[PDB]
Amino acid sequence: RPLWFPGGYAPSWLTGQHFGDRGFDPAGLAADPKVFERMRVSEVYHGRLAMLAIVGAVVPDIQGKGAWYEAAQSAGIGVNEVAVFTAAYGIAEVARGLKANSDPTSRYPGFDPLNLTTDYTKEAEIKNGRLALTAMLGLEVQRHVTGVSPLVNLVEHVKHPLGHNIAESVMHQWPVA
Amino acid sequence: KYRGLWFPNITPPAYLTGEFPADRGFDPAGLAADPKVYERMRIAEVFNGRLAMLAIVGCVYPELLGNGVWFEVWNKVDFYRFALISLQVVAPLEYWRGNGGFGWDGEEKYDRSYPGFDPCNLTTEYTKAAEIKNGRLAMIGMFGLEVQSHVTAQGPVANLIEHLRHPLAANIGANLAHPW
Amino acid sequence: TPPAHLTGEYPADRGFDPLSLAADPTVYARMRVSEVFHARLSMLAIVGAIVPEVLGKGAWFEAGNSVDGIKLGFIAMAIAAPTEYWRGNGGFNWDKGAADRSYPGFDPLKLTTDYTKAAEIKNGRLAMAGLLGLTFQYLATGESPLANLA
Amino acid sequence: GHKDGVWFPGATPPAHLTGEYPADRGFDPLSLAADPTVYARMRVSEVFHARLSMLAIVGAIVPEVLGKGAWFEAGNSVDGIKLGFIAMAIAAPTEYWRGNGGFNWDKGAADRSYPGFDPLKLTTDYTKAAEIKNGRLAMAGLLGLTFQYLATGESPLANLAAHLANPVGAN
Numbered sequence: 242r243p244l245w246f247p248g249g250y251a252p253s254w255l256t257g258q259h260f261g262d263r264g265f266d267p268a269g270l271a272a273d274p275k276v277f278e279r280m281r282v283s284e285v286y287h288g289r290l291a292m293l294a295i296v297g298a299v300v301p302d303i304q305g306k307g308a309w310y311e312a313a314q315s316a317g318i319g320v321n322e323v324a325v326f327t328a329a330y331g332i333a334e335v336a337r338g339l340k341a342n343s344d345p346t347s348r349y350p351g352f353d354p355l356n357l358t359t360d361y362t363k364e365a366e367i368k369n370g371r372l373a374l375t376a377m378l379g380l381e382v383q384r385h386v387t388g389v390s391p392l393v394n395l396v397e398h399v400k401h402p403l404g405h406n407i408a409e410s411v412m413h414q415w416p417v418a
Numbered sequence: 419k420y421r422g423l424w425f426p427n428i429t430p431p432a433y434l435t436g437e438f439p440a441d442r443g444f445d446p447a448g449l450a451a452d453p454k455v456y457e458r459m460r461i462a463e464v465f466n467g468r469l470a471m472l473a474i475v476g477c478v479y480p481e482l483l484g485n486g487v488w489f490e491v492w493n494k495v496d497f498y499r500f501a502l503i504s505l506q507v508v509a510p511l512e513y514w515r516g517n518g519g520f521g522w523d524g525e526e527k528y529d530r531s532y533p534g535f536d537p538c539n540l541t542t543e544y545t546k547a548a549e550i551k552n553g554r555l556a557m558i559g560m561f562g563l564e565v566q567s568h569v570t571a572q573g574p575v576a577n578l579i580e581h582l583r584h585p586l587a588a589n590i591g592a593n594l595a596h597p598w
Numbered sequence: 599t600p601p602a603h604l605t606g607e608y609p610a611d612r613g614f615d616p617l618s619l620a621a622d623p624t625v626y627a628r629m630r631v632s633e634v635f636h637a638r639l640s641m642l643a644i645v646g647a648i649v650p651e652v653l654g655k656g657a658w659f660e661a662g663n664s665v666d667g668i669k670l671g672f673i674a675m676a677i678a679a680p681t682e683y684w685r686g687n688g689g690f691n692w693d694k695g696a697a698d699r700s701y702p703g704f705d706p707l708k709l710t711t712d713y714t715k716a717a718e719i720k721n722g723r724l725a726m727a728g729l730l731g732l733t734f735q736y737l738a739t740g741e742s743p744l745a746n747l748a
Numbered sequence: 749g750h751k752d753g754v755w756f757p758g759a760t761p762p763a764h765l766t767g768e769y770p771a772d773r774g775f776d777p778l779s780l781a782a783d784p785t786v787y788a789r790m791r792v793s794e795v796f797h798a799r800l801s802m803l804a805i806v807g808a809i810v811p812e813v814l815g816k817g818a819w820f821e822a823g824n825s826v827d828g829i830k831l832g833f834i835a836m837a838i839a840a841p842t843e844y845w846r847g848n849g850g851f852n853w854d855k856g857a858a859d860r861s862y863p864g865f866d867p868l869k870l871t872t873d874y875t876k877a878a879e880i881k882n883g884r885l886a887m888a889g890l891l892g893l894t895f896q897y898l899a900t901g902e903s904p905l906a907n908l909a910a911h912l913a914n915p916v917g918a919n
């Protein structure tokens with residue numbers, strides 16, 4: 242069993258059936274079996290949404306329309322505009338949330354025009370999701386500690402790796418932005 | 419289990435049998451006669467050694483790169499911020515090391531000297547001895563660095579280069595003959 | 599109605615788990631130790647946020663321009679390092695414990711009753727709630743604790 | 749076997765310490781004396797460290813009482829390097845003779861801790877246990893004198909003169 246940490250200890254509730262089981266739950270948050278299925282739904286959801294986010298945080302900063310934290314106010318989008326979007330998104334959300342957490346369609350609604358559903362693709366979805374979820378966490382924290390755009394952060398680190406890293410950055414008063 | 423000894427014709431202590439890596443019959447001060455202390459001492463020896471190995475590369479390499487000397491770093495860097503942030507970062511890691519895992523009761527019983535963080539499957543009772551011996555060498559080294567820091571007041575690469583350039587006018591004899 | 603995993607064996611039990619966080623027993627054991635420690639820490643804090651501000655020392659959010667926060671932070675972390683390790687380990691030795699790490703030894707008066715065990719956590723829960731509140735009032739106004747009472 | 753008690757109220761003595769040698773109070777938490785042959789050596793070293801400390805704490809005070817400065821001003825009043833050289837040149841035979849138990853190459857088998865210099869015949873178990881007791885004080889005292897000088901910087905006797913006229917506000 243491939244696990245998240247070396248030594249060979251998995252929780253009992255995490256058996257190795259579901260996609261992405263790496264024996265990782267040291268806080269026992271999926272010990273109860275009914276909560277597990279909801280969480281299995283929301284991991285994929287959070288994952289897909291972050292995937293979209295992370296691609297949407299880089300592409301308009303490449304194109305030179307400002308960084309992601311200064312991209313709302315740079316093209317308008319106030320709190321009323323997020324309210325109208327949130328009302329519009331609600332319809333699809335309640336359509337999603339009318340079904341149970343035990344139905345496989347609650348994660349996998351079947352919209353597959355290319356017919357690329359295998360098991361390899363489900364694990365690949367979950368892995369790219371968790372990578373994008375940590376990447377969003379990274380974006381937010383970097384935003385506050387360094388106070389510049391993420392592409393700037395990457396470019397400084399590639400050009401001057403000792404110069405600009407977490408160690409340098411965290412030795413100044415960091416909540417700056 | 420033939421093993422060498424630290425001094426020619428001595429006889430080893432009876433509690434040092436060669437059962438463990440890098441045993442050379444060396445315990446004149448009898449600090450490992452009890453077996454449970456000898457267990458902790460063994461973990462401590464490998465851990466002080468690992469840290470001295472990191473330290474001595476950390477001390478030498480930025481001076482080679484011209485980023486400064488290791489004992490003068492605290493006039494450019496604030497010590498107290500560095501030490502606060504370091505203890506925040508290190509604490510859960512050291513906790514887990516001593517604990518044996520993430521659980522409150524240990525639970526996931528791991529070796530706290532030799533966990534499995536080895537992707538190349540290189541671990542033998544020989545590489546263990548090499549790790550110990552490299553570590554002992556580094557500990558002696560870091561002792562050297564500190565004493566040299568006080569006596570000569572130059573960095574260790576500078577101290578080496580001075581010995582190479584003027585081997586008679588830059589050695590322990592000449593440096594201790596003067597007030598220093 | 600009490601939940602299934604949450605039975606009434608342990609002190610300060612009221613059958614509260616709408617989130618099922620403590621389903622597993624060993625998790626619940628850790629939870630319990632962590633609740634007691636959080637309670638015990640929050641009391642010294644709720645008092646330590648009033649008692650040296652009554653006597654003319656300035657408020658809890660004013661502590662920054664009365665101490666060296668970085669240096670005191672270093673001192674606190676340097677004394678927490680041994681002592682928290684000793685609390686966690688159950689003593690000083692390399693191999694763990696058998697000296698109960700929630701309720702160790704300090705009771706020369708024989709006051710360890712189930713009532714007092716429950717009252718450790720009872721007084722703690724609203725010291726926690728209090729401290730959670732105490733900050734929230736400062737963020738929504740700009741006022742001190744005893745100034746928030748007016 | 750501890751008639752005279754132990755270092756901590758309810759403490760258990762260690763297994764190697766069984767109240768047989770003088771001034772045993774069952775104190776060895778780091779188990780440095782588990783090996784008996786080593787403990788034999790340890791005993792001599794403690795008594796010697798004790799006897800050296802008692803001459804030293806006297807020598808740090810009794811000169812100061814007779815108005816000669818404190819112990820850290822002794823470097824002004826003597827040539828520090830030179831006396832250090834004669835001390836090391838006089839210690840060399842006498843320490844060798846102490847360790848060898850005599851003058852001959854093949855050892856002496858005299859008690860090298862308790863040699864026999866006693867014209868008053870006071871050598872008793874009480875006095876052996878009082879050598880170490882007064883000794884452990886003087887070591888602790890000397891450990892004080894250094895740490896007092898590092899935290900303060902006045903004389904030893906001045907720190908006492910502070911504490912009687914400043915019980916609260918000494919530390």
Ligand SMILES: CC1=C(C#C/C(C)=C/C=C/C(C)=C/C=C/C=C(C)/C=C/C=C(C)/C=C/[C@@]23O[C@]2(C)C[C@@H](O)CC3(C)C)C(C)(C)C[C@H](O)C1
Nearest residue numbers: 776777778779780797800801804807808819822887888891
């Ligand atoms: C026992 C034990 C343990 C222990 C311990 C402890 C606390 C050990 C420590 C003992 C200690 C503290 C030993 C001091 C020595 C000082 C000496 C020798 C004196 C020399 C000093 C001299 C010769 C100075 C001479 C002076 O001339 C000078 C230079 C200047 C002059 O002006 C004045 C004088 C005359 C003063 C553990 C570790 C807790 C566990 C273990 O299991 C059991």
